[PDB]
Swiss-Prot record, chain A:
Component of the RPD3C(L) complex composed of at least ASH1, CTI6, DEP1, PHO23, RPD3, RXT2, RXT3, SAP30, SDS3, SIN3, UME1 and UME6. Component of the RPD3C(S) complex composed of at least EAF3, RCO1, RPD3, SIN3, and UME1. Interacts with ESS1 and STB1. It is found in: Nucleus. This is Transcriptional regulatory protein SIN3. Catalytic component of the RPD3 histone deacetylase complexes RPD3C(L) and RPD3C(S) responsible for the deacetylation of lysine residues on the N-terminal part of the core histones (H2A, H2B, H3 and H4). Histone deacetylation gives a tag for epigenetic repression and plays an important role in transcriptional regulation, cell cycle progression and developmental events. SIN3 also has a RPD3 independent function required for normal longevity. The gene is SIN3. Present with 1660 molecules/cell in log phase SD medium. It comes from the Eukaryota. The lineage of its organism: Eukaryota, Fungi, Dikarya, Ascomycota, Saccharomycotina. Residues 1-55 form the PAH domain.
UniProtKB/Swiss-Prot annotation, chain F:
CDD domains: RPD3-like. Changing residue 334 to A: Strongly reduces HDAC activity. It comes from the Eukaryota. Disruption phenotype: Heterochromatin spreading downstream of the silent mating-type locus HMR. Changing residue 327 to A: Strongly reduces HDAC activity. One of its GO terms (biological process) is negative regulation of transcription by RNA polymerase I. This is Histone deacetylase RPD3.
Curated annotation (Swiss-Prot), chain G:
It comes from Saccharomyces cerevisiae (strain ATCC 204508 / S288c). This is Transcriptional regulatory protein RXT2. Belongs to the RXT2 family. Component of the RPD3C(L) complex composed of at least ASH1, CTI6, DEP1, PHO23, RPD3, RXT2, RXT3, SAP30, SDS3, SIN3, UME1 and UME6. Present with 1630 molecules/cell in log phase SD medium. Component of the RPD3C(L) histone deacetylase complex (HDAC) responsible for the deacetylation of lysine residues on the N-terminal part of the core histones (H2A, H2B, H3 and H4). Histone deacetylation gives a tag for epigenetic repression and plays an important role in transcriptional regulation, cell cycle progression and developmental events. The gene is RXT2. It is found in: Nucleus.
UniProtKB/Swiss-Prot annotation, chain H:
Belongs to the SDS3 family. It comes from Saccharomyces cerevisiae (strain ATCC 204508 / S288c). The gene is SDS3. Present with 105 molecules/cell in log phase SD medium. It is found in: Nucleus. This is Transcriptional regulatory protein SDS3. Component of the RPD3C(L) histone deacetylase complex (HDAC) responsible for the deacetylation of lysine residues on the N-terminal part of the core histones (H2A, H2B, H3 and H4). Histone deacetylation gives a tag for epigenetic repression and plays an important role in transcriptional regulation, cell cycle progression and developmental events. SDS3 is required for the HDAC activity of the complex and for the RPD3-SIN3 association.
Length: 288, 130, 96, 138, 101, 393, 165, 37
């Protein structure tokens, strides 16, 4: 009562507290709404939060004591070939959503350590051809096109529903329309990355802003650009489809021949008299 | 590169590129009741026994178009019935008005708050209107 | 050395011929003209006469020096996907 | 002052009492079960049969017969479970106070619990973060 | 493709509705048994006693009578807890060293 | 304890039928690690297409599962890790240069737009599959967006950022005593094994390639510490292993585990970097050889939860996933692909086939005999005490 | 005089001969096993009751496929002819549970069948909610038991490291 | 030979983008943008 000062806003504050006590508000939205009255004072707020029984679901980064450590696992006690014991202080890392069997079943002190091993085989190291390496680039470019195009094709779907609805509404509903982040559907990330792909990686911000504040002015205008780039990009894609389809039909079958491709020289080199003698194993030459 | 667009772009990136602290998430005013989960609104209207219909969520409000006008939801919420839901702004304005006019004086607002907070974990306790 | 390779090929012969003889084509690929016929513009496909006799005849043509090595290799790949690389030098072993 | 180690002594008493309480109730539950071993099998059978089927009327009649034959023994179980739960919650509060007072005392030293300082490892961390902060200063 | 996703839309709706109803039934019958237990718990006239570690009380056991130590000053439900204690799973009371020596 | 045999025609047995619940979310394909990265979620979408166009959707039920929440992620991960994942974007990375260094972020696991949402989809699908399996609704539960088995409780490792399989098994353990996990990737399933190493309620079983490889762990002598000793099975193998070899190694290990451990909920990782032609793996498995594992794990008859994993040649993961999904419905598909929106990517003959190469098998009857004998020996200390009445698992 | 006395130090958890018989007992771990093993059987039951009630609530606990939603077929102008060179927005019309429609092929027999169908719904609901409360109790119990076992093990470990063992 | 590589997918030109941004700003009611066509 001393801090809030005025009696009118204090009255509204008390009415929100009563809104909680009357079993209408919830605890989290209660503290959220109290923020506007008890924000600038921290001790009042934390006494309140302890009073009401308010616990955060996870901890921030700016206030955590037992951090993660880049620790050199060379100086730690080993068990078996791979695992090493952690220091004790790195086992008090906060995992705020664990219940009792999430502590019974999970393992907290042993970490794995990778051992670089040299193999028993005396042989040549299997590798990749150049034919197997043309395919990977073909598929990288196929994927790049498919990614940009099929990501355009979902923002199209959303903006299309929104424009179909805007065309069936009055003028006061046009000046009284607003859309939440997510534009009314499940995802909240894809349409923004589309918008800064098509427009600008820096000025797509203003378009997304005016898309949230003025959906009736801003998003029949944006939908007519996504539909333009859809056709441009699909034109280019079905053009290059034949180039890739040509470059594939040769190296595909020459790409699963691991032995042959060098078996030519190998059979040249392992039919000499030296080796044909050495296979008899009772004759000795000397081991290389 | 003209001493205006420079700081224009600068303000844009300085306002849209941050470290997403939970301490900066934009919080709504307490008096704007449209930002209230639409279940708070229904519980308020149902507790003080106001006389409103329920609201259209957001999917039912974009469902209104010449193409959308053939779905079961439109034809169950727009014909002649009594359950005809409305736009969230209307219900929120009714709730806001019943909030600013019905009034309270303490001496019973505080002790009820304390009894409520100290019994949160209890299932069997005083229901302060029910 | 030569005999053993020919023996493995003549052991695979039966399954290989009745696999190349029951090959189907995927209709939409035929109608959109997506497949190729290079190894049929050259007769290098192993149509319904046996595959052993064909690889023999093609080995002979390769020895006489009219059939390039590239196309002998490619025909062997597509008819014997991973099973007849040990014939790619059937001309340089005989020569020795 | 001295240290008579009261936390660990009460902890020993608790941990010895924990398994004696439980087994009486477990035997009570086993006793309740022994009535429901010619009712639950054929009930499950008839329910799955009716679920995956002139006679169905008699089948549903049999199912209701067995249901309200077997109803009384299902309140025994949850009564026993409730008293078991209250007993074990008493024991758990006992345990937790003993534990917290052991830790709040030094019946477990705080260099043996939360480990050592500077731990011959962790020079990698100091190198890495030192370089980050250094070229942050650069 | 549009026929298939039509079927998918209707199947997902059916799933969510049946979950709704089973969950509301379970919640009401939960609240009923909790009401029952909290009702009978108000009927006890003499509670159970149990052992524990003697604590320092207001006008009681021994350290506050003879002028030796302070009291135990219980803490609030929900408060700054140390993270190590939050790992030893927890339930922490009695801000600082409750026991009476 | 290993005799090599020929590889028999994969064939569905009619005495058991399942109720497949398939989980898919039309958003997932829309995320991309970066320019040249080998990890492409788009392939999940591609598999969906074939499922639609083969007529396979008509015997199962296709659901979107709600994304997993921050506090469902922190059941296994730390708060600092998950808070980093939630706050980091390709634009503000410069203000997290410590955490990126500290959580193993930047080259093998970069930050893209939509990282947290992609992780939410994976975890949600896995946990909802597990929950629906607990409620007695479905028998098999498929989620190809999950299986990121290389992620650490506090670290990003190996294209993975969130271990959804750990959350799935945690939800499966609320109602089950003993859970089996099978991992037939070409890498070692090291996140799940590190997570459940000192317990006996999760038995992990990996079939991987041990060498100068990734991650570097999972020897034949790494079998569990504490009360979890003998509850971690590794099968290290060498290059070139093919269908007959793999089947003769894979079947008896799994069958002995089923007879001894008696688990009664199986999770199955079906990674696809273990196929011939993959760009990171080095096995020589066909599509029938890779699917006979699924068919065998299914022929037992206990709740299965199938998940995705690796596979870095999109065409081959798409085809083998669609074929496996057809097999879970007691359906052997047809080899000619139907026309779909990805009627490329399937050169040169447009069929339902994955073709092996002729590269050489570096695994011979004595190495395998030794490995399997050591395993059969390690795997007899893991039974249940004689007085412990079960529920016929 | 040695049996009967208190801990004098941390090392006494392994050195003492009576106190060591407690902190090394394999007993808090077998109880948790028996508990989960009974939870599993009771969940089998909960599952088999929870579908009877749904057959009698109207819901269809059977799996509904593309051929059960007898959706009305539509027609847009796709699927062109050879070489030439709304019922969309409608609702499934789900027929009936086969268990319920298998009952139907007088008035007295009909009221008999009505009372039977009423009794089934109410009995199954009671049994289901009771089994669910049973399971919730069992889970609280097992949580307490494994909490005790974990505390025991941490003390054992700190003790055996204090001695240098 | 081979070595044939698909060129990168392109976006709107700065002038088409400038026209849309000033038109959205005009229809709404904000002051003029700093870059005019
Ligand atoms: K593996
Ligand atoms: K384990
Ligand atoms: Zn892998």
């Amino acid at each position: 009562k001393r801090y809030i000062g005025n009696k009118h806003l204090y009255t509204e504050f008390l009415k929100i507290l009563n809104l909680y006590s009357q079993d209408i508000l919830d605890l989290d939205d209660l503290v959220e709404k109290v923020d506007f009255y008890l924000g600038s004072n921290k001790e009042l707020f934390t006494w309140f939060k302890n009073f009401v029984g308010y616990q955060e679901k996870t901890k921030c980064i700016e206030n955590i004591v037992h951090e993660k450590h880049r620790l050199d696992l060379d100086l730690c006690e080993a068990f078996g070939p791979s695992y090493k014991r952690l220091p004790k202080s790195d086992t008090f890392m906060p995992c705020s959503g664990r219940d009792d069997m999430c502590w019974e079943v999970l393992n907290d002190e042993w970490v794995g350590h990778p051992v670089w091993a040299s193999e028993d085989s005396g042989f040549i190291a299997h590798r990749k051809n150049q034919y197997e390496e043309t395919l990977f680039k073909i598929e990288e470019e196929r994927h790049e096109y498919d990614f940009y195009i099929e990501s355009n094709l979902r923002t199209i779907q959303c903006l299309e529903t929104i424009v179909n609805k805007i065309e069936n509404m009055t003028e006061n509903e046009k000046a009284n329309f607003k859309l939440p982040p997510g534009l009314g559907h499940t995802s909240m990330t894809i349409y923004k990355k589309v918008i800064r792909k098509v427009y600008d990686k820096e000025r797509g911000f203003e378009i997304i802003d005016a898309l949230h504040e003025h959906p009736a002015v801003t998003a029949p205008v944006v939908l007519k650009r996504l539909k333009q780039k859809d056709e441009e990009w699909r034109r280019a894609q079905r053009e290059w489809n034949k180039v890739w389809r040509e470059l594939e039909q040769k190296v595909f079958f020459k790409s699963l021949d691991h032995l042959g491709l060098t078996f030519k020289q190998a059979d040249k080199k392992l039919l000499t008299t030296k080796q044909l003698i050495s296979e008899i194993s009772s004759i000795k030459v000397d081991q290389t | 590169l003209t001493a205006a667009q420079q700081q224009y772009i600068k303000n844009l990136i300085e306002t849209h590129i941050t470290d997403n602290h939970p301490d900066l998430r934009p919080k709504s005013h307490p008096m704007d009741f449209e930002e209230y989960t639409d279940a708070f609104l229904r519980r308020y209207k149902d507790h003080f026994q106001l006389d409103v219909p329920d609201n259209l969520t957001l999917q039912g409000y974009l469902l209104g178009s010449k193409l959308g006008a053939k779905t079961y939801s439109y034809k169950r919420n727009t014909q002649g019935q009594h359950d005809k839901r409305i736009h969230k702004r209307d219900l929120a304005n009714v709730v806001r008005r019943h909030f600013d006019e019905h009034s309270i004086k303490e001496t019973d607002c505080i002790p009820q708050f304390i009894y409520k907070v100290k019994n949160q974990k209890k299932k069997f306790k005083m229901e302060f209107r029910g | 050395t030569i005999y053993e390779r020919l023996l493995e090929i003549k052991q695979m012969n039966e399954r290989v011929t009745k696999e190349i003889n029951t090959r189907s084509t995927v209709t939409f690929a035929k109608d959109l003209d997506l497949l190729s016929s290079q190894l049929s513009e050259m007769g290098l496909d192993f149509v319904g006469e046996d595959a052993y006799k064909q690889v023999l005849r093609l080995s002979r043509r390769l020895i006489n020096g009219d059939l390039e090595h590239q196309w002998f290799e490619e025909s062997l790949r597509q008819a014997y996907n991973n099973k007849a690389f040990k014939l790619y030098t059937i001309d340089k072993v005989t020569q020795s | 002052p001295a240290n008579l180690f009261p936390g660990l002594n009460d902890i020993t008493d608790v941990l010895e009492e924990f398994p004696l309480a439980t087994s009486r109730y477990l035997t009570l539950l086993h006793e309740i079960d022994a009535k429901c071993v010619h009712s639950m099998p054929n009930l499950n059978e008839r329910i799955d049969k009716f679920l995956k089927k002139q006679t169905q009327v008699r089948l549903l009649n049999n199912i209701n017969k067995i249901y309200e034959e077997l109803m009384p023994s299902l309140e025994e179980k949850m009564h026993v479970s409730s008293i078991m739960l209250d007993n074990l919650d008493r024991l758990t509060s006992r345990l937790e106070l003993a534990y917290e007072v052991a830790i709040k005392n030094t019946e477990i030293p705080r260099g043996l619990r939360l480990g050592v300082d500077n731990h011959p490892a962790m020079h990698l961390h100091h190198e890495l973060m030192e370089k980050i902060e250094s070229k942050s200063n650069s | 493709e549009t026929i298939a996703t039509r079927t998918f839309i209707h199947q997902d709706f059916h799933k969510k509705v049946t979950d709704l109803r089973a969950r509301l039934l379970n919640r009401t019958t939960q609240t009923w048994y909790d009401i029952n237990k909290e009702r009978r718990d108000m009927d006890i006239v003499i509670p159970d006693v149990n052992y524990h570690v003697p604590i320092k009380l207001d006008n009681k056991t021994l350290s506050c009578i003879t002028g030796y130590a302070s009291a135990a000053q219980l803490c609030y439900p929900g408060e700054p807890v140390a993270e190590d204690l939050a790992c030893e799973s927890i339930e922490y009371r009695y801000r600082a060293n409750p026991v009476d020596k | 304890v290993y005799e090599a045999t020929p590889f028999d025609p994969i064939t569905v047995k009619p005495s058991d039928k399942r109720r497949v619940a398939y989980f898919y979310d039309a958003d997932v394909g829309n995320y991309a690690y970066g320019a040249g990265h080998p990890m492409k979620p788009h392939r999940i979408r591609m598999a969906h297409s074939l499922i639609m166009n083969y007529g396979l959707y008509k015997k199962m039920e296709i659901y979107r599962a709600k994304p997993a929440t921050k506090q469902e992620m922190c059941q296994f991960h730390t708060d600092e890790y998950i808070d980093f994942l939630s706050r980091v974007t390709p634009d503000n990375l410069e203000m997290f240069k410590r955490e990126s260094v500290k959580f193993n972020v930047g080259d093998d696991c970069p930050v893209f737009d939509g990282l947290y949402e992609y992780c939410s989809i994976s975890g949600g699908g896995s946990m909802e599959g597990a929950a629906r399996l607990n409620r007695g609704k479905c028998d098999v539960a498929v989620n190809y967006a999950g299986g990121l088995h290389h992620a650490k409780k506090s670290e990003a490792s190996g294209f993975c950022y969130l271990n959804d399989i750990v959350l799935g098994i945690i939800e499966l353990l609320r109602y089950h005593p003993r859970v089996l996990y099978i991992d037939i990737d070409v890498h070692h399933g090291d996140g799940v094994e590190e997570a459940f190493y000192t317990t006996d309620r999760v038995m992990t079983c990996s079939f991987h390639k041990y060498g100068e490889f990734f991650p570097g762990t999972g020897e034949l002598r790494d079998i569990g510490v504490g009360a979890g000793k003998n509850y971690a099975v590794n099968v290290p193998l060498r290059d070139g292993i093919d269908d007959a070899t793999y089947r003769s190694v894979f079947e008896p290990v799994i069958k002995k585990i089923m007879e001894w451990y008696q688990p009664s909920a199986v999770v199955l990782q079906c990674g696809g970097d273990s196929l011939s032609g993959d760009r990171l793996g080095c096995f020589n498995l066909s599509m029938e050889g890779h699917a006979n594992c699924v068919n065998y794990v299914k022929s037992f008859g206990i709740p299965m939860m199938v998940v995705g994993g690796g596979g870095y040649t999109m065409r081959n993961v798409a085809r083998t996933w669609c074929f496996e999904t057809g097999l879970l419905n007691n359906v052997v598909l047809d080899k000619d692909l139907p026309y779909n929106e990805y009627y490329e990517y399937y050169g040169p003959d447009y069929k339902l086939s994955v073709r092996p190469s002729n590269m050489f098998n570096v695994n011979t009857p004595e190495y395998l005999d030794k490995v399997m004998t050591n395993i059969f020996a390690n795997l007899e200390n893991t039974k249940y005490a004689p007085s412990v009445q079960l529920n016929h698992t | 005089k040695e049996i009967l006395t208190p801990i004098l130090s941390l090392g006494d958890i392994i050195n003492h001969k009576t106190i060591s018989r407690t902190f090394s007992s394999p007993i808090l771990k077998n109880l948790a096993l028996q508990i989960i093993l009974m939870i599993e059987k009771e969940q089998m039951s909960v599952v088999r009751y929870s579908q009877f009630l749904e057959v009698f609530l109207g819901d269809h606990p059977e799996p509904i496929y593309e051929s059960n939603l007898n959706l009305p077929s539509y027609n847009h102008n796709l699927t062109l002819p050879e070489d030439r060179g709304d019922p969309f927005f409608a609702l499934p019309r789900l027929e009936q549970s086969n268990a319920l429609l298998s009952l139907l092929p007088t008035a007295a027999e009909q009221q008999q069948l009505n009372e039977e169908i009423e009794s089934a719904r109410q009995l199954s609901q009671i049994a289901l909610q009771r089994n669910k409360e049973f399971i919730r109790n069992l889970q609280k119990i097992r949580k307490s038991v494994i909490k005790a076992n974990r505390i025991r093990g941490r003390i054992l470990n700190w003790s055996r490291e204090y001695l240098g063992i | 030979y081979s070595t044939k590589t698909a060129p990168p997918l392109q976006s709107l030109k700065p002038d088409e983008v400038t026209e849309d941004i000033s038109l959205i700003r005009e229809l709404t009611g904000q002051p003029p943008a700093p870059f005019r066509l």
